């Protein structure tokens, strides 16, 4: 696809977003660079606003899968890089099991040459003991299959998926992702076929970062498609 043609190198990334969890709110930057050849993300984010009301691995999939690597035989079925640059709104609602659920609006886009991606949070019905404003989650993250089915009638795609989130005390929190992508321009997308993407990421810290933060290196890559 033409969009395409804009991720064959490496591309600068901003991420914003404004959140608010049973009424605690913040906000969160990032930047960083995506490298979509190797379906590659490194990014770092900072709460800007003081300490996150929530932990940091809840975040990692509304804070960008028009970076995912997707393999020559499946170039007709990357719906995210076919909507740039005009870009598309991503929503999800996120049900934590257990727990309280975050609803999610973004739109992705390019602005020039950097790749932004600017979102809004709420989350509503956590536990004030759970593991999310309880804090009770490792600093650390999973990977997981994120599926993929087109919704024609709106032009876009319906994805789905489960996290598993390690607990400090050995058991995992699930959350459900349900997830809606339009594009924002008027042009023609690629509607895929069935497939997936594979995750895997890696959490660390900046160790001259004082502020509350996250740097991730993230590898995103379809499948799910035979060659």
């Given at each position: 696809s033409k969009?395409?043609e804009?991720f ?9 977003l ?6 605690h ?6 930047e960083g660079?995506?490298?979509?050849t190797?379906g590659?993300?490194?990014?770092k984010?900072?709460?800007?606003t003081g300490?996150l009301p ?7 999939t509304?804070?960008?899968?028009c970076?995912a690597?997707?393999?020559?035989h ?8 076919s909507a ?8 999800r ?6 727990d309280?659920?975050?609803?999610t609006?973004a739109?992705?886009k ?11 949070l709420?989350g509503?019905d956590f ?7 309880g ?7 999973n990977?997981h299959?994120?599926?993929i089915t ?9 994805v789905?998926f489960?996290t598993?989130?390690?607990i ?7 959350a ?8 924002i ?8 076929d ?10 660390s810290?900046?160790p001259?970062?004082?502020?509350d ?10 499948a799910?498609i035979t060659?």
């Amino acid at each position: 696809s033409k969009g395409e043609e804009l991720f064959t190198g490496v591309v600068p990334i901003l991420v914003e977003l404004d959140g608010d969890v049973n009424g605690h709110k913040f906000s969160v930057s990032g930047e960083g660079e995506g490298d979509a050849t190797y379906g590659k993300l490194t990014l770092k984010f900072i709460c800007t606003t003081g300490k996150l009301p929530v932990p940091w691995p809840t975040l990692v999939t509304t804070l960008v899968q028009c970076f995912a690597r997707y393999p020559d035989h499946m170039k007709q079925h990357d719906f995210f890089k076919s909507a740039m640059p005009e870009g598309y709104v991503q929503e999800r609602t996120i049900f934590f099991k257990d727990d309280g659920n975050y609803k999610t609006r973004a739109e992705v886009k390019f602005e020039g040459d950097t790749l932004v991606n600017r979102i809004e949070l709420k989350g509503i019905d956590f536990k004030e003991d759970g593991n999310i404003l309880g804090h009770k989650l490792e600093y650390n993250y999973n990977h997981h299959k994120v599926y993929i089915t087109a919704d024609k009638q709106k032009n876009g795609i319906k994805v789905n998926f489960k996290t598993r989130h390690n607990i400090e005390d050995g058991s995992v929190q699930l959350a459900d992702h349900y997830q809606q992508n339009t594009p924002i321009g008027d042009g023609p997308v690629l509607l895929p076929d069935n497939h997936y993407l594979h995750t895997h990421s890696k959490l660390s810290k900046d160790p001259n970062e004082k502020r509350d933060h996250m740097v991730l290196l993230e590898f995103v890559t379809a499948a799910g498609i035979t060659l």
